[PDB]
Amino acid sequence: EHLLEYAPQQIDISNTRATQSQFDTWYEAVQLAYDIGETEMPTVMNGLMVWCIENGTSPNINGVWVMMDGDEQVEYPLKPIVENAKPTLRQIMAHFSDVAEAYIEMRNKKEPYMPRYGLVRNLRDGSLARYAFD
Amino acid sequence: HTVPRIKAITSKMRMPKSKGATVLNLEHLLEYAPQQIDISNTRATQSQFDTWYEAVQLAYDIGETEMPTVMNGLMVWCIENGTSPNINGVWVMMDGDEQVEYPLKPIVENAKPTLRQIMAHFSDVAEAYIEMRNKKEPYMPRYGLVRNLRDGSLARYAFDFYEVTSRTPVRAREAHIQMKA
Amino acid sequence: HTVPRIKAITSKMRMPKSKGATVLNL
């Protein structure tokens, strides 16, 4: 009587997506590392995935990621993000996979815009670009 | 009577949430559109290019308003001989017929993460320069001559530090693809 | 609006002191 009523979403119980308990830990841990309060970090995470779209999700820990204000680049250390992401950054970043395609398609209607995941692998198509991030 | 139209479906789309609050503000995403090559990783960071610019400036003991002349010939050399030379080497730049030599150790050593990514900042000017010097005599950089690039028009996309942006021609992208020939 | 830049940190650097007075003149 419970199985004929228990229908969970496939992606919620999946293993490719990191657990909701393991995403909150990564969210708060990165929040503590950057010394950025709430109601302001969403701006930082607003540009984290845009960077991760272009440059994949397996970068060097000692590196740095960039986000633009107008024309000036701002830099955030990459060590807290990769180090505090369990089991890995890709699975933690998969929570944004629903928004990434909506963002890529939004920026593909005015000029061609292909993430580097496709350019390196020679993805010779225009419409199939919103499914081309790591 | 009225034909029975199919009830349109609506794909709910899952926001990434954290303790009942979303982690993304959408009024900023619907307005945040950075240039692809600026946030890219193939091009070295603007903060990592200024360091390489000043460091090489200090190493050559050449003041400002004069170094642009030196950098005017650095990329021309780098077009012909790639961007991964020996550190202990030397690069050449001509005044008329006389060659002048600059040590290659400061340039390669102080280039982070690598010389190619630091030199990619000139990739927009290199094709404009190659095309300018290709309209009077055939002029193919050695990156193409070694790999047998059998074309004349597709020569301005044939240097080592060319960055594949979204707007390069498809023929250029494949022309980069074969790599070693 | 303006991107939230990371508050630069400043590594204090410990002078060798002796009875409240430094032993090095910089």
Side-chain angles (χ1 to χ4, degrees):
Chain A
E1 89 270 30
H2 183 307
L3 211 41
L4 308 151
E5 181 255 320
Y6 171 88
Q9 293 314 130
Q10 181 189 352
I11 208 64
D12 283 28
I13 71 200
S14 189
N15 230 13
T16 187
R17 150 178 309 216
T19 312
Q20 173 58 36
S21 147
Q22 297 196 30
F23 175 85
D24 274 345
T25 296
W26 169 94
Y27 182 81
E28 308 296 4
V30 166
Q31 176 153 9
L32 164 154
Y34 286 2
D35 195 48
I36 305 205
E38 199 178 2
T39 76
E40 199 49 26
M41 204 153 163
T43 318
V44 152
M45 221 75 68
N46 214 73
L48 175 46
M49 97 178 167
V50 186
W51 184 90
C52 263
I53 284 186
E54 295 302 320
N55 319 342
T57 38
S58 286
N60 42 11
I61 290 191
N62 321 297
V64 84
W65 67 273
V66 74
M67 156 175 206
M68 331 285 278
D69 167 332
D71 59 352
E72 150 205 10
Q73 300 197 323
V74 317
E75 287 210 312
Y76 303 90
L78 211 63
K79 158 189 202 71
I81 289 171
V82 184
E83 161 198 354
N84 289 337
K86 293 282 140 282
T88 179
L89 181 60
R90 170 174 25 84
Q91 301 181 36
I92 272 286
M93 271 306 258
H95 285 239
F96 300 103
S97 170
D98 316 315
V99 190
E101 33 172 81
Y103 163 85
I104 294 199
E105 191 56 352
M106 171 266 257
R107 258 188 51 120
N108 239 357
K109 49 170 278 320
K110 277 175 274 247
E111 63 185 342
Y113 169 38
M114 161 95 77
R116 266 164 81 266
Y117 194 23
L119 281 193
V120 176
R121 310 172 38 247
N122 204 47
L123 181 78
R124 207 182 65 252
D125 273 345
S127 178
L128 158 85
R130 62 213 288 276
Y131 314 130
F133 36 93
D134 188 324
Chain B
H1 306 319
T2 325
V3 175
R5 302 176 251 274
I6 216 164
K7 197 177 321 302
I9 197 175
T10 66
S11 61
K12 202 172 182 179
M13 171 204 97
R14 276 192 62 56
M15 281 315 178
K17 324 262 201 203
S18 161
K19 324 222 181 193
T22 197
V23 300
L24 258 48
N25 64 344
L26 266 282
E27 89 270 30
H28 183 306
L29 211 40
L30 308 151
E31 181 255 320
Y32 171 88
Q35 293 314 130
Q36 181 189 352
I37 208 64
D38 283 28
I39 71 200
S40 189
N41 230 13
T42 187
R43 150 177 309 216
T45 312
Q46 173 58 36
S47 147
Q48 297 196 30
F49 175 85
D50 274 345
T51 296
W52 169 94
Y53 182 81
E54 308 296 4
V56 166
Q57 176 153 9
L58 164 154
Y60 286 2
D61 195 48
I62 305 205
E64 199 178 2
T65 76
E66 199 49 26
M67 204 153 163
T69 318
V70 152
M71 221 75 68
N72 214 73
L74 175 46
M75 97 178 167
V76 186
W77 184 90
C78 263
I79 284 186
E80 295 302 320
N81 319 342
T83 38
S84 286
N86 42 11
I87 290 191
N88 321 297
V90 84
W91 67 273
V92 74
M93 156 175 206
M94 331 285 278
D95 167 332
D97 59 352
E98 150 205 10
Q99 300 197 322
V100 317
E101 287 210 312
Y102 303 90
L104 211 63
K105 158 189 202 71
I107 289 171
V108 184
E109 161 198 354
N110 289 337
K112 293 282 140 282
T114 179
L115 181 60
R116 170 174 25 84
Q117 301 181 36
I118 272 286
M119 271 306 258
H121 285 239
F122 300 103
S123 170
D124 316 315
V125 190
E127 33 172 81
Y129 163 85
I130 294 199
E131 191 56 352
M132 171 266 257
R133 258 188 50 120
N134 239 357
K135 49 169 278 320
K136 277 175 274 247
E137 63 185 342
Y139 169 38
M140 161 95 77
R142 266 164 81 266
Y143 194 23
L145 281 193
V146 176
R147 310 172 38 247
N148 204 47
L149 181 78
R150 207 182 65 252
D151 272 345
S153 178
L154 158 85
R156 62 213 288 276
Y157 314 130
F159 36 93
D160 188 325
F161 56 93
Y162 187 39
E163 50 180 353
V164 281
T165 189
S166 100
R167 324 171 281 161
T168 89
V170 177
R171 64 181 171 150
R173 284 178 30 201
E174 41 185 346
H176 266 237
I177 274 176
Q178 295 85 0
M179 301 285 218
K180 235 180 178 179
Chain C
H1 306 319
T2 325
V3 175
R5 302 176 251 274
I6 216 164
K7 197 177 322 302
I9 197 175
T10 66
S11 61
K12 202 172 182 179
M13 171 204 97
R14 276 192 62 56
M15 281 315 178
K17 324 262 201 203
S18 161
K19 324 222 181 193
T22 197
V23 300
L24 258 48
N25 64 344
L26 266 283

Coordinates of all heavy atoms in Angstrom, one line a residue, chain A residues 73-113:
Chain A
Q73 N 37.5 42.8 -13.7 CA 37.4 41.4 -13.2 C 37.6 41.4 -11.7 O 38.5 42.1 -11.1 CB 38.5 40.6 -13.8 CG 38.4 40.5 -15.3 CD 39.2 39.3 -15.9 OE1 40.3 39.1 -15.4 NE2 38.6 38.7 -16.9
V74 N 36.8 40.6 -11.0 CA 37.0 40.3 -9.5 C 37.4 38.9 -9.4 O 36.9 38.0 -10.2 CB 35.8 40.8 -8.7 CG1 35.3 42.1 -9.1 CG2 34.8 39.7 -8.7
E75 N 38.2 38.6 -8.4 CA 38.8 37.2 -8.3 C 38.4 36.6 -6.9 O 38.5 37.3 -5.9 CB 40.3 37.3 -8.4 CG 40.8 37.5 -9.8 CD 42.1 36.8 -10.0 OE1 43.1 37.0 -9.2 OE2 42.3 36.2 -11.0
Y76 N 37.9 35.4 -6.9 CA 37.6 34.7 -5.7 C 38.5 33.4 -5.6 O 38.6 32.7 -6.6 CB 36.2 34.3 -5.6 CG 35.2 35.5 -5.7 CD1 34.7 35.9 -6.9 CD2 34.8 36.1 -4.6 CE1 33.9 36.9 -7.0 CE2 33.9 37.2 -4.6 CZ 33.5 37.6 -5.9 OH 32.6 38.7 -6.0
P77 N 39.1 33.1 -4.5 CA 39.9 31.9 -4.4 C 39.1 30.6 -4.7 O 37.9 30.5 -4.3 CB 40.4 31.9 -2.9 CG 39.4 32.7 -2.2 CD 38.9 33.8 -3.2
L78 N 39.7 29.7 -5.4 CA 39.1 28.4 -5.8 C 39.3 27.3 -4.7 O 38.6 26.3 -4.9 CB 39.6 28.0 -7.1 CG 38.6 27.2 -8.0 CD1 37.5 28.1 -8.4 CD2 39.4 26.8 -9.3
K79 N 40.1 27.5 -3.8 CA 40.4 26.5 -2.8 C 39.2 26.1 -2.0 O 38.9 24.9 -1.8 CB 41.6 26.9 -1.9 CG 41.6 26.1 -0.6 CD 42.7 26.8 0.3 CE 43.1 25.8 1.4 NZ 43.9 24.7 0.8
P80 N 38.4 27.0 -1.4 CA 37.3 26.6 -0.6 C 36.2 25.9 -1.3 O 35.6 25.0 -0.8 CB 36.7 27.9 0.0 CG 37.2 29.0 -0.9 CD 38.6 28.5 -1.3
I81 N 36.0 26.3 -2.6 CA 34.9 25.7 -3.4 C 35.2 24.2 -3.7 O 34.3 23.3 -3.4 CB 34.7 26.5 -4.7 CG1 34.0 27.8 -4.3 CG2 33.8 25.7 -5.6 CD1 34.0 28.8 -5.5
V82 N 36.3 23.9 -4.2 CA 36.7 22.5 -4.6 C 36.9 21.7 -3.4 O 36.4 20.5 -3.3 CB 37.9 22.5 -5.5 CG1 38.1 21.1 -6.0 CG2 37.6 23.4 -6.7
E83 N 37.6 22.2 -2.4 CA 37.9 21.4 -1.2 C 36.7 21.0 -0.4 O 36.6 19.9 0.1 CB 38.9 22.2 -0.3 CG 39.1 21.7 1.1 CD 39.7 22.7 2.0 OE1 40.2 23.7 1.5 OE2 39.7 22.5 3.2
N84 N 35.8 21.9 -0.2 CA 34.6 21.7 0.6 C 33.4 21.0 -0.1 O 32.4 20.9 0.4 CB 34.1 23.0 1.3 CG 35.1 23.5 2.3 OD1 35.9 22.7 2.9 ND2 35.1 24.8 2.6
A85 N 33.7 20.6 -1.4 CA 32.6 20.0 -2.2 C 32.7 18.5 -2.1 O 33.7 17.9 -2.6 CB 32.7 20.5 -3.6
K86 N 31.7 17.9 -1.5 CA 31.7 16.4 -1.3 C 30.4 15.9 -2.0 O 29.3 16.5 -1.9 CB 31.7 16.0 0.1 CG 33.0 16.3 0.8 CD 34.1 15.3 0.5 CE 35.4 15.9 0.3 NZ 35.5 16.6 -1.0
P87 N 30.5 14.8 -2.7 CA 31.7 14.0 -3.0 C 32.6 14.6 -4.1 O 33.8 14.3 -4.1 CB 31.1 12.7 -3.5 CG 29.8 13.0 -4.1 CD 29.3 14.1 -3.2
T88 N 32.1 15.5 -4.9 CA 33.0 16.2 -5.9 C 32.2 17.5 -6.3 O 31.1 17.7 -6.0 CB 33.3 15.3 -7.1 OG1 34.1 16.1 -8.0 CG2 32.0 14.9 -7.8
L89 N 33.0 18.4 -7.0 CA 32.4 19.6 -7.4 C 31.4 19.5 -8.4 O 30.3 20.2 -8.4 CB 33.5 20.6 -7.9 CG 33.0 21.9 -8.3 CD1 32.3 22.6 -7.2 CD2 34.1 22.8 -8.9
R90 N 31.6 18.5 -9.4 CA 30.6 18.3 -10.4 C 29.2 18.0 -9.9 O 28.2 18.5 -10.3 CB 31.1 17.3 -11.4 CG 30.0 16.8 -12.4 CD 30.6 15.9 -13.5 NE 31.7 15.1 -13.0 CZ 31.6 14.0 -12.2 NH1 30.5 13.5 -11.9 NH2 32.8 13.4 -11.8
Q91 N 29.2 17.0 -8.9 CA 27.9 16.6 -8.3 C 27.3 17.7 -7.5 O 26.1 17.8 -7.4 CB 28.1 15.3 -7.5 CG 28.6 14.2 -8.4 CD 28.8 12.9 -7.6 OE1 28.0 12.6 -6.7 NE2 29.8 12.2 -7.9
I92 N 28.1 18.5 -6.8 CA 27.6 19.6 -6.1 C 27.1 20.7 -7.0 O 26.0 21.3 -6.8 CB 28.7 20.2 -5.1 CG1 28.7 19.5 -3.8 CG2 28.5 21.7 -4.9 CD1 27.5 19.8 -2.9
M93 N 27.8 20.9 -8.1 CA 27.3 21.9 -9.1 C 26.2 21.4 -9.9 O 25.6 22.3 -10.6 CB 28.5 22.3 -10.0 CG 29.3 23.5 -9.4 SD 28.3 24.9 -9.0 CE 28.7 25.9 -10.4
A94 N 25.9 20.2 -9.9 CA 24.7 19.6 -10.7 C 23.4 20.2 -10.3 O 22.4 20.2 -11.0 CB 24.7 18.1 -10.7
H95 N 23.3 20.7 -9.0 CA 22.1 21.3 -8.6 C 21.7 22.6 -9.4 O 20.5 22.9 -9.4 CB 22.2 21.8 -7.1 CG 22.2 20.6 -6.2 ND1 21.2 20.5 -5.2 CD2 22.9 19.5 -6.0 CE1 21.4 19.4 -4.5 NE2 22.4 18.8 -5.0
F96 N 22.6 23.2 -10.1 CA 22.4 24.3 -11.0 C 22.1 23.8 -12.4 O 21.9 24.7 -13.3 CB 23.6 25.3 -11.0 CG 23.9 25.8 -9.7 CD1 24.9 25.4 -8.9 CD2 23.1 26.8 -9.1 CE1 25.2 25.9 -7.7 CE2 23.4 27.4 -7.9 CZ 24.5 26.9 -7.2
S97 N 22.0 22.5 -12.7 CA 21.9 22.1 -14.1 C 20.6 22.5 -14.7 O 20.5 22.6 -15.9 CB 22.1 20.6 -14.2 OG 21.8 20.1 -15.4
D98 N 19.6 22.7 -13.9 CA 18.3 23.1 -14.4 C 18.3 24.6 -14.8 O 17.7 25.0 -15.8 CB 17.2 22.9 -13.4 CG 17.2 21.6 -12.7 OD1 17.5 20.6 -13.4 OD2 17.1 21.5 -11.5
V99 N 19.1 25.4 -14.1 CA 19.2 26.8 -14.4 C 20.2 27.1 -15.6 O 20.1 28.1 -16.3 CB 19.6 27.6 -13.2 CG1 19.4 29.1 -13.4 CG2 18.7 27.2 -12.0
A100 N 21.2 26.3 -15.7 CA 22.3 26.5 -16.7 C 21.7 26.5 -18.1 O 22.0 27.4 -18.9 CB 23.4 25.5 -16.5
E101 N 20.9 25.5 -18.4 CA 20.4 25.5 -19.8 C 19.4 26.6 -20.0 O 19.4 27.2 -21.2 CB 19.6 24.1 -20.0 CG 18.9 23.6 -18.8 CD 18.1 22.4 -19.2 OE1 18.7 21.3 -19.3 OE2 16.9 22.5 -19.3
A102 N 18.7 27.1 -19.0 CA 17.8 28.3 -19.2 C 18.7 29.5 -19.4 O 18.3 30.4 -20.1 CB 16.9 28.4 -18.0
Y103 N 19.8 29.6 -18.7 CA 20.7 30.7 -18.9 C 21.4 30.7 -20.3 O 21.5 31.7 -21.0 CB 21.7 30.8 -17.8 CG 22.9 31.7 -18.1 CD1 22.9 33.1 -17.9 CD2 24.1 31.2 -18.6 CE1 23.9 33.9 -18.1 CE2 25.2 32.0 -18.8 CZ 25.1 33.3 -18.6 OH 26.2 34.1 -18.9
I104 N 21.9 29.5 -20.7 CA 22.6 29.4 -22.0 C 21.7 29.7 -23.1 O 22.0 30.5 -24.0 CB 23.2 28.0 -22.1 CG1 24.3 27.8 -21.1 CG2 23.8 27.8 -23.5 CD1 25.3 26.7 -21.5
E105 N 20.5 29.2 -23.1 CA 19.5 29.5 -24.1 C 19.1 31.0 -24.1 O 19.0 31.6 -25.2 CB 18.2 28.7 -23.9 CG 17.2 28.7 -25.1 CD 17.8 28.3 -26.5 OE1 19.0 28.1 -26.6 OE2 17.0 28.1 -27.4
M106 N 19.1 31.6 -22.9 CA 18.8 33.1 -22.9 C 19.9 33.9 -23.6 O 19.6 34.9 -24.2 CB 18.6 33.5 -21.4 CG 18.5 35.0 -21.3 SD 20.1 35.8 -20.9 CE 19.9 36.0 -19.1
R107 N 21.1 33.5 -23.4 CA 22.2 34.2 -24.0 C 22.6 33.7 -25.4 O 23.6 34.2 -26.0 CB 23.5 34.1 -23.1 CG 23.7 35.4 -22.3 CD 25.0 35.4 -21.6 NE 26.1 35.0 -22.5 CZ 27.2 35.7 -22.7 NH1 27.3 36.9 -22.2 NH2 28.1 35.3 -23.5
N108 N 21.9 32.7 -25.9 CA 22.1 32.2 -27.2 C 21.2 32.7 -28.3 O 21.4 32.5 -29.5 CB 22.0 30.6 -27.3 CG 23.3 30.0 -27.7 OD1 24.2 30.6 -28.1 ND2 23.3 28.6 -27.7
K109 N 20.1 33.5 -27.8 CA 19.2 34.0 -28.8 C 19.6 35.3 -29.4 O 19.0 35.8 -30.4 CB 17.8 34.2 -28.1 CG 17.9 34.9 -26.8 CD 16.5 35.3 -26.3 CE 16.1 36.6 -27.0 NZ 17.2 37.6 -27.1
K110 N 20.7 35.9 -28.9 CA 21.1 37.2 -29.5 C 22.5 37.1 -30.2 O 22.6 37.7 -31.3 CB 21.3 38.3 -28.4 CG 20.0 39.0 -28.0 CD 20.2 39.9 -26.8 CE 20.0 39.2 -25.5 NZ 18.9 39.6 -24.7
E111 N 23.4 36.3 -29.7 CA 24.6 36.0 -30.5 C 24.9 34.5 -30.2 O 24.5 33.9 -29.2 CB 25.8 36.8 -30.0 CG 26.3 36.7 -28.6 CD 27.5 37.6 -28.2 OE1 28.1 38.2 -29.1 OE2 27.7 37.9 -27.0
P112 N 25.7 33.9 -31.2 CA 26.0 32.5 -30.9 C 26.9 32.4 -29.6 O 27.8 33.2 -29.5 CB 26.9 32.1 -32.1 CG 26.4 32.9 -33.2 CD 26.2 34.3 -32.5
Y113 N 26.6 31.5 -28.7 CA 27.3 31.5 -27.4 C 27.4 30.0 -27.1 O 26.4 29.4 -26.6 CB 26.6 32.3 -26.4 CG 27.1 32.1 -25.0 CD1 28.5 31.9 -24.7 CD2 26.2 32.0 -23.9 CE1 28.9 31.7 -23.4 CE2 26.7 31.8 -22.6 CZ 28.0 31.6 -22.4 OH 28.5 31.4 -21.1

